[PDB]
Amino acid sequence: SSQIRQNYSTEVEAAVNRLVNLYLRASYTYLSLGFYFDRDDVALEGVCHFFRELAEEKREGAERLLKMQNQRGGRALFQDLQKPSQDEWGTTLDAMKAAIVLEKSLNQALLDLHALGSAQADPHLCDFLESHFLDEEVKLIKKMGDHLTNIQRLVGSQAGLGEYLFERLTLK
Amino acid sequence: SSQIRQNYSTEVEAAVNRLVNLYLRASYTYLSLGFYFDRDDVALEGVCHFFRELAEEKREGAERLLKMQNQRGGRALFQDLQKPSQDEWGTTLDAMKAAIVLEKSLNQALLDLHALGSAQADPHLCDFLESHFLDEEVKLIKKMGDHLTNIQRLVGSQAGLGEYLFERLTLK
Amino acid sequence: SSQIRQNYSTEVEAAVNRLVNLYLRASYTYLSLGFYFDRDDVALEGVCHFFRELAEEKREGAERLLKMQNQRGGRALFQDLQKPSQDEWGTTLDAMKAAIVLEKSLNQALLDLHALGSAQADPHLCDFLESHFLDEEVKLIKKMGDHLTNIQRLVGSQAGLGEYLFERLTLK
Amino acid sequence: SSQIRQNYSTEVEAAVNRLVNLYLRASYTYLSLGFYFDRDDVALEGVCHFFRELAEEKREGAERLLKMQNQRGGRALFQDLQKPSQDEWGTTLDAMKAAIVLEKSLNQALLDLHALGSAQADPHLCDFLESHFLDEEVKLIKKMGDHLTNIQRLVGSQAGLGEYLFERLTLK
Ligand SMILES: [Ir+4]
Ligand SMILES: [Ir+4]
Ligand SMILES: [Ir+4]
Ligand SMILES: [Ir+4]
Ligand SMILES: [Ir+4]
Ligand SMILES: [Ir+4]
Ligand SMILES: [Ir+4]
Ligand SMILES: [Ir+4]
Ligand SMILES: [Ir+4]
Ligand SMILES: [Ir+4]
Ligand SMILES: [Ir+4]
Ligand SMILES: [Ir+4]
Numbered sequence: 001s002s003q004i005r006q007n008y009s010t011e012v013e014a015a016v017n018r019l020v021n022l023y024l025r026a027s028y029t030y031l032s033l034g035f036y037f038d039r040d041d042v043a044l045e046g047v048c049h050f051f052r053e054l055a056e057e058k059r060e061g062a063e064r065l066l067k068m069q070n071q072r073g074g075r076a077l078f079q080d081l082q083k084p085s086q087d088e089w090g091t092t093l094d095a096m097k098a099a100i101v102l103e104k105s106l107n108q109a110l111l112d113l114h115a116l117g118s119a120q121a122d123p124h125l126c127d128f129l130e131s132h133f134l135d136e137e138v139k140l141i142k143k144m145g146d147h148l149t150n151i152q153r154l155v156g157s158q159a160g161l162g163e164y165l166f167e168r169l170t171l172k
Numbered sequence: 173s174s175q176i177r178q179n180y181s182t183e184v185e186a187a188v189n190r191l192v193n194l195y196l197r198a199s200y201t202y203l204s205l206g207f208y209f210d211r212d213d214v215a216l217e218g219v220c221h222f223f224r225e226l227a228e229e230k231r232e233g234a235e236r237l238l239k240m241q242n243q244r245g246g247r248a249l250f251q252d253l254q255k256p257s258q259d260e261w262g263t264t265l266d267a268m269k270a271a272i273v274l275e276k277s278l279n280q281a282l283l284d285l286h287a288l289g290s291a292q293a294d295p296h297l298c299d300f301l302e303s304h305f306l307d308e309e310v311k312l313i314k315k316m317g318d319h320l321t322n323i324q325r326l327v328g329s330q331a332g333l334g335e336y337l338f339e340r341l342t343l344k
Numbered sequence: 345s346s347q348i349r350q351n352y353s354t355e356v357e358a359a360v361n362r363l364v365n366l367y368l369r370a371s372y373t374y375l376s377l378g379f380y381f382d383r384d385d386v387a388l389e390g391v392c393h394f395f396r397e398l399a400e401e402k403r404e405g406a407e408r409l410l411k412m413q414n415q416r417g418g419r420a421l422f423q424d425l426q427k428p429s430q431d432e433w434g435t436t437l438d439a440m441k442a443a444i445v446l447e448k449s450l451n452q453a454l455l456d457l458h459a460l461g462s463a464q465a466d467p468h469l470c471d472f473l474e475s476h477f478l479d480e481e482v483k484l485i486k487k488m489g490d491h492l493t494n495i496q497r498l499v500g501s502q503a504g505l506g507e508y509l510f511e512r513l514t515l516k
Numbered sequence: 517s518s519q520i521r522q523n524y525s526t527e528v529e530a531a532v533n534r535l536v537n538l539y540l541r542a543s544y545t546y547l548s549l550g551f552y553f554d555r556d557d558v559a560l561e562g563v564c565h566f567f568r569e570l571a572e573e574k575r576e577g578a579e580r581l582l583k584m585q586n587q588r589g590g591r592a593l594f595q596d597l598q599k600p601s602q603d604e605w606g607t608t609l610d611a612m613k614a615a616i617v618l619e620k621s622l623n624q625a626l627l628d629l630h631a632l633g634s635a636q637a638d639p640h641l642c643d644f645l646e647s648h649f650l651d652e653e654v655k656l657i658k659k660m661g662d663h664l665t666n667i668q669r670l671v672g673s674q675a676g677l678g679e680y681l682f683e684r685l686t687l688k
């Protein structure tokens with residue numbers, strides 16, 4: 001058992017384990033999104049690469065959370081990783097919408113953990129969440145929103161042309 | 173009080189102070205234009221960056237004017253900076269039109285000061301205005317007109333597509 | 345309208361817009377302070393340069409605030425920028441006193457926004473304010489206080505000599 | 517005789533020759549000022565060097581005027597160079613006052629030639645005077661005024677100390 005654990009509640013420890021599962025689930029979702037856009041009948045490599053890099057970011061998020069759990073003397077517990085919500089992701093517009101929904105859900109979970117850690121008087125936790133996750137989520141969600149606006153502007157008329165152009169001129 | 177002031181009328185001194193306020197107002201306008209195009213629901217970063225760089229140019233214009241006022245022994249006097257004319261700027265076409273209107277107004281003010289300094293026999297002033305402001309305004313207004321023509325050509329049919337393309341292929 | 349806004353109250357959004365106006369007003373104040381010390385009858389270039397660099401810092405502060413407002417999905421709204429409180433700034437002592445008063449007012453506004461964001465449960469805001477504004481204001485105000493103490497020590501007897509010396513040996 | 521002279525009046529030609537004599541006289545004045553501050557009983561080497569460099573500037577001004585006179589097909593005519601107005605120049609304050617009086621007189625002569633060339637419709641002349649003389653005189657006279665203000669501030673009490681300090685900390 002730990003000899004280091006201090007000011008680290010069992011409620012926070014569990015919530016950290018839930019958040020690890022959420023980040024890993026999000027990484028898996030992004031893996032599926034990435035490979036969908038690599039299908040020969042979809043073939044938007046800029047979209048594939050955008051989602052694959054998000055898969056990596058989310059996995060790294062989970063790993064940072066796991067290192068933090070061990071730094072505080074908590075115990076990592078892993079659960080089943082639920083398969084992604086869809087097997088086919090539609091258009092780049094549909095996929096970007098799905099991505100923002102996913103990210104807002106991760107953000108809301110961070111906010112819920114921060115609130116819990118406030119109620120627990122755990123400032124190391126508040127700080128850790130702030131500096132490596134909350135600012136990153138805000139920045140990511142702004143980029144996604146920007147992309148969604150550009151996609152929408154493009155696929156008002158001539159949807160195929162607009163999807164190609166966004167991929168070619170925004171995504172790489 | 174000054175020991176250096178020579179051939180520098182109180183009328184020119186006041187007009188220089190009015191022009192400083194106009195350049196600063198124009199810088200503020202461009203700040204507002206820039207951030208509007210950075211909204212998640214507008215999201216034209218090439219447009220944001222074009223206007224932000226104009227904000228900087230106009231501030232530098234005012235600073236050069238203030239240094240000149242002190243070089244001649246005049247006294248800088250600052251007034252309220254009126255907020256920009258709009259809170260939302262519409263399309264890139266609308267914004268570019270607003271920009272050219274603004275720049276033509278600055279130009280006309282430079283021309284009016286040059287006329288005043290003629291009537292005052294103040295060639296240092298004529299020279300200073302010419303070399304650091306009048307040629308720059310002519311060049312800037314030509315670039316704006318060029319941009320307006322390209323935007324107009326693009327948004328005749330398929331306005332969203334054309335706005336995206338101008339941003340991507342002209343503005344960066 | 346925004347597709348990204350999350351946990352970002354209308355009260356915080358408005359307070360951020362007020363703070364942008366305060367930073368810009370402070371930048372304008374510093375512009376006026378800087379050019380006053382560049383008058384031929386004042387002629388303290390170290391003082392001019394100290395205030396001009398603060399003008400730049402305050403403008404950058406406002407720009408960071410505006411980028412943050414857009415990152416959260418809030419809407420920038422600009423108001424009239426009130427001219428500075430004085431047209432002539434007296435001695436370097438008077439000016440430094442004015443500067444510290446100004447900075448303490450900006451600081452108090454940051455503290456008031458941080459309190460609001462506490463009451464709103466907005467940790468992204470707390471973090472953003474902390475890391476890019478609160479530590480900077482504390483450091484700046486300490487430097488100003490140090491300068492004020494040195495000026496005061498100098499202008500106890502032989503005020504002209506002391507003002508020259510501070511400018512020459514502290515300010516550059 | 518010239519085969520090139522065009523739009524270059526005998527009135528302008530004579531005024532250019534008078535201005536050459538004024539620049540050379542000013543160079544001579546600065547030579548005398550420089551060596552005075554190099555006396556063992558004055559011994560302000562920063563002041564010596566400031567005036568010696570102005571002697572060089574004024575000679576170069578005259579040489580540019582002479583090259584211009586030949587470029588337009590006018591004929592250089594030289595007159596007696598009147599010795600400087602004083603043989604001893606007093607304090608650094610007295611000398612700086614004398615310098616600004618001298619420079620304002622050169623400036624006024626440039627302005628008078630510019631007016632003449634206006635009345636003569638000679639824009640090459642206006643341009644030449646503007647770009648190589650009028651802006652330089654304005655900049656020089658502002659630096660002199662700044663220096664005068666600093667000297668005055670220093671020699672309010674403890675005149676010897678203040679003169680030493682200005683020389684050491686402003687002039688090199
Ligand atoms: Ir990449
Ligand atoms: Ir890559
Ligand atoms: Ir990449
Ligand atoms: Ir917290
Ligand atoms: Ir941490
Ligand atoms: Ir590109
Ligand atoms: Ir390419
Ligand atoms: Ir650029
Ligand atoms: Ir750039
Ligand atoms: Ir740029
Ligand atoms: Ir003119
Ligand atoms: Ir100039």
Ligand SMILES: [Ir+4]
Pocket residue numbers: 393
């Ligand atoms: Ir500096």
Ligand SMILES: [Ir+4]
Pocket residue numbers: 393
């Ligand atoms: Ir500097």
Ligand SMILES: [Ir+4]
Pocket residue numbers: 393397
């Ligand atoms: Ir600096």
Ligand SMILES: [Ir+4]
Pocket residue numbers: 458462470
């Ligand atoms: Ir807080």
Ligand SMILES: [Ir+4]
Pocket residue numbers: 135412471472
């Ligand atoms: Ir931030």
Ligand SMILES: [Ir+4]
Pocket residue numbers: 565
């Ligand atoms: Ir030198």
Ligand SMILES: [Ir+4]
Pocket residue numbers: 565
């Ligand atoms: Ir030298």
Ligand SMILES: [Ir+4]
Pocket residue numbers: 565569
């Ligand atoms: Ir030198």
Ligand SMILES: [Ir+4]
Pocket residue numbers: 295630634642
């Ligand atoms: Ir002229």
Ligand SMILES: [Ir+4]
Pocket residue numbers: 584643644
């Ligand atoms: Ir010339």
Ligand SMILES: [Ir+4]
Pocket residue numbers: 516685
């Ligand atoms: Ir120095």
Ligand SMILES: [Ir+4]
Pocket residue numbers: 688
């Ligand atoms: Ir030295």
Ligand SMILES: [Pd+2]
Pocket residue numbers: 045048049050052
């Ligand atoms: Pd890829």
Ligand SMILES: [Pd+2]
Pocket residue numbers: 217220221222224
């Ligand atoms: Pd930008």
Ligand SMILES: [Pd+2]
Pocket residue numbers: 389392393394396
């Ligand atoms: Pd400066």
Ligand SMILES: [Pd+2]
Pocket residue numbers: 561564565566568
């Ligand atoms: Pd020398």
